[PDB]
Structure 1
């Protein structure tokens, strides 16, 4: 992957705010369907995603484009809405985190630019 202004923003602004939020803990590592006794979790949720995975990917320059990281956040949130029941608190927690995600994304740099300057030519 690479380091861009938008990915750096997703790491140092967006993930920094979401990771430390009071509602973050169920999303900080993959859903552990075995420990949770949920044999249908991986039958219903075909692309699991969580903030621990996204954070490690940002730390390791896994992404080539901010849009890929944004889609991972979206998948994490949508997985939660799809698997759980409308009135569960976890849905409200996902919704609260997603609102912050969108609020912070609104101030992301407009043009995706590489931050690593290379020798000209």
Structure 2
């Protein structure tokens, strides 16, 4: 509602658009949707990951205006990467893709106005 916050969220929407861009598909695609625990066979996933997150949910939460400011948004993004890091062994390819995508995110998020 404040302009400061309104502008923070526009920047966040732009950051979300960036990581959804075809440019980053080859390492962003597993984060477009929730981890499909059943289809994949990850019997321990919800034991390890108490709060799943994914880019499609973040897009919908933004669309529903559920982020009060930029840091609430960054927390969901960072939760998504942390979930990947915590569940997978460090050399699984999805962890490399998560690091790559997180470097995209933090590069753009570090420019948000102070």
CA distance in 2, matches of 1:60, 1:109: 23
- The structural deviation recorded for 1:86 is 1.0
Please tell me whether residue 55 in structure 1 is matched to residue 59 in structure 2: yes
* Structure 2 equivalent of residue 16 of structure 1: 17
Q: Structure 1: state its 5+ residue gaps.
A: 111-121
Equivalent residue number for residue 118 of structure 1: none
Is 2:81 the counterpart of 1:73?
no
Structure 2 Cα separation of the partners of residues 41 and 107 of structure 1: 34
Give the gaps of 5 or more residues in structure 2. Answer: none
Dislocated runs of 4+, deviation >2 Å: none
Determine the C-alpha separation between the residues in 2 that align with 1:29 and 1:7.
Answer: 21
Separation in 1, partners of 2:65, 2:72: 12
Instruction: State the structure with more CA Rg.
Output: 1
Q: TM-score, normalised by structure 2?
A: 0.89
RMSD: 1.5
TM norm structure 1: 0.84
Provide the secondary structure at the position in 2 that maps to 1:75.
helix
Higher RCO by CA contacts (8 Å cutoff, separation 6 or greater): 1
Q: Name which of 100, 105, 111 aligns with 1:107.
A: 111
